[PDB]
Swiss-Prot record, chain B:
The chain holds residues 432 to 531 of 1224 of the full protein. Part of the dynactin complex that activates the molecular motor dynein for ultra-processive transport along microtubules. Plays a key role in dynein-mediated retrograde transport of vesicles and organelles along microtubules by recruiting and tethering dynein to microtubules. Binds to both dynein and microtubules providing a link between specific cargos, microtubules and dynein. It is found in: Cytoplasm; Cytoplasm, Cytoskeleton; Cytoplasm, Cytoskeleton, Microtubule organizing center, Centrosome; Cytoplasm, Cytoskeleton, Microtubule organizing center, Centrosome, Centriole. It comes from Gallus gallus. It comes from the Eukaryota. Monomer and homodimer. Subunit of dynactin, a multiprotein complex part of a tripartite complex with dynein and a adapter, such as BICDL1, BICD2 or HOOK3. The dynactin complex is built around ACTR1A/ACTB filament and consists of an actin-related filament composed of a shoulder domain, a pointed end and a barbed end. Its length is defined by its flexible shoulder domain. The soulder is composed of 2 DCTN1 subunits, 4 DCTN2 and 2 DCTN3. DCTN1/p150(glued) binds directly to microtubules and to cytoplasmic dynein. Ubiquitously expressed. Signal peptide: none annotated. Belongs to the dynactin 150 kDa subunit family. This is Dynactin subunit 1.
């Protein structure tokens, strides 16, 4: 009769555990779905990041180009102003010789 | 049946052992996911940072470009004028030289 008390006690514990396993499974299942979506969102980001990383010196090169092109012009100017001076000196000197 | 019934009891003691183990594994699996979720969230955030940094770097450089492009146009004009002038002086000097 006792063995029966102990036996019924156990049939409960099984029912209890089966329920708990069901919940754990379900919870784990649900998280897996989220984790799936997280993995794809990341993969998306990584793609967007590579596009931007490209755009960044596609641009930081364009900047260098221009910055060089200006320095070139400052030199070209610096030279024209030397030249013009020089031609003025010559002209002036020619005029006095008249 | 205190012989045929201890059989039933022994049967059950196994089922609990089996289930306890299973739960253990489920717990550990769950734990594992928690670790993944934390890494995911931090890696996602790290990326979002990196994206904003780049987006900034781009806009900034693209305006540095625009600055120069303006500065250059100014210089082209200044040059265009010096070139005209230079011509003009040459014409005047050449013509003066022939007259002596």
């Amino acid at each position: 009769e006792t063995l029966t008390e102990r036996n019924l006690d156990l049939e409960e514990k099984v029912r209890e555990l089966r329920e708990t396993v069901g919940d754990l499974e379900a919870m784990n299942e649900m998280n897996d779905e989220l984790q799936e979506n997280a993995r794809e969102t990341e993969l998306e980001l990584r793609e967007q990041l590579d596009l931007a990383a490209a755009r960044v010196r596609e641009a930081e090169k364009r900047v260098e180009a221009a910055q060089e092109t200006v320095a070139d012009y400052q030199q070209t100017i610096k030279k024209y102003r030397e030249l013009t001076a020089h031609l003025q000196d010559v002209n002036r000197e020619l005029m006095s010789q008249q």
